Amino acid sequence: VNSFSGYLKLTDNVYIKNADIVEEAKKVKPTVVVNAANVYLKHGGGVAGALNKATNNAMQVESDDYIATNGPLKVGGSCVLSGHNLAKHCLHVVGPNVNKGEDIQLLKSAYENFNQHEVLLAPLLSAGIFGADPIHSLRVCVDTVRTNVYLAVFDKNLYDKLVSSFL
Fold this sequence. Notes:
With 167 residues, this protein is an alpha/beta fold. It is built from six helices and seven strands, in the order ββαβααββαβαβα.
């Protein structure tokens, strides 16, 4: 049994809810919240900008030190950093950004990072300002992630379309 409330069950291991991931993280304090990161961990906008704002920029400060030591992530890759006030850990995952021309096949590799964590609160990778089709992102999630994932979808309209169209 876990703390997550109000989710619709899509499969054995994937759950979805219309929710602000920031507000959900604040309520649940999950072991892992996933960030929709870029390779530079520059948390300017979208999910990343919202998570970082909710940490009062402490996520960005920590991220800048990570990059200064390790260099950029790979598209499809991830790193584990602090969850600050939102979660125990933040898994920063880089999905491909279609608005930069990145290979959508890298979306599966991105979701494979989730399998290193038994339970996660996450957004749909490569959705929103990363430019991918969220319906596609949800299909890749279901077909790739085997651990228990609780997906937060900010937009109510999109949430209802994801559920209604789910095979």
